[PDB]
RNA sequence: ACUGGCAGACUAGAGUACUGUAGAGGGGGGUAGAAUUUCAGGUGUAGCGGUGAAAUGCGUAGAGAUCUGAAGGAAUACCGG
């Protein structure tokens, strides 16, 4: 382990799962945790609370590297946007900046077809 | 008288010249930025993805995530009504 104190939390909140990848500021991965690896499956992955746990699990694995300050980059529309960020505050970590990093095409590729469900 | 013909006349219709104005009008060429995919390398480690739920699929040969770069094609967020 290289001990780092300043880092970046990259919350990837899909509508299905939520991934949390705490990195150094140079974007090398240190820890990751996912709603659908932190216990919850099918329906319950896609809940705030599953993502919270992902964040918690990742947080208490990020302390091995001795991280202290994180910037949160919240990327996507999922339920695990807000909850993960709370779970980083309420796990010690000082949050410096909360960026949104959602990829927005400036008209680009034709999305998949509409679901005639 | 009215319609037509013929020979004139007229400027209200129609058109011309002049100067501006707005405009995703058209055709050609170039270029920008965002994003997707693929690929290469770094970090990293067990999931990812998907759904009503799931399975097919993808992943330990290292995925997904994340960083950087590259290469392509297509379409031009906001403005925007």
From TrEMBL:
Keyword hit for Ribonucleoprotein: yes
GO terms for biological process, alphabetical: translation
Any one GO molecular function term: rRNA binding
Protein keywords: Ribonucleoprotein, Ribosomal protein, RNA-binding, rRNA-binding
PROSITE patterns from the UniProt entry: RIBOSOMAL_S11
UniProt-listed SUPFAM superfamilies: Translational machinery components
Subunit structure: Part of the 30S ribosomal subunit. Interacts with proteins S7 and S18. Binds to IF-3.
Family: Belongs to the universal ribosomal protein uS11 family.
Protein known as: Small ribosomal subunit protein uS11
Organism: Vibrio natriegens NBRC 15636 = ATCC 14048 = DSM 759
Gene that this polypeptide is encoded by: rpsK
């Amino acid at each position: 382990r290289k001990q780092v104190a300043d880092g970046v939390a990259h919350i990837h909140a899909s509508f299905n799962n939520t991934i949390v990848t705490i990195t150094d500021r140079q974007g090398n991965a240190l820890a990751w945790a996912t709603a659908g690896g932190s216990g919850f499956r099918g329906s319950r992955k896609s809940t705030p609370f599953a993502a919270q746990v992902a964040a918690e699990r990742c947080a208490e694995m990020a302390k091995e590297y001795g991280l202290k300050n994180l910037e949160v980059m919240v990327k996507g529309p999922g339920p695990g946007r807000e909850s993960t960020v709370r779970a980083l505050n309420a796990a010690g970590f000082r949050i410096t900046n909360i960026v949104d990093a959602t990829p927005i095409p400036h008209n680009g590729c034709r999305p998949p077809k509409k679901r005639r469900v």
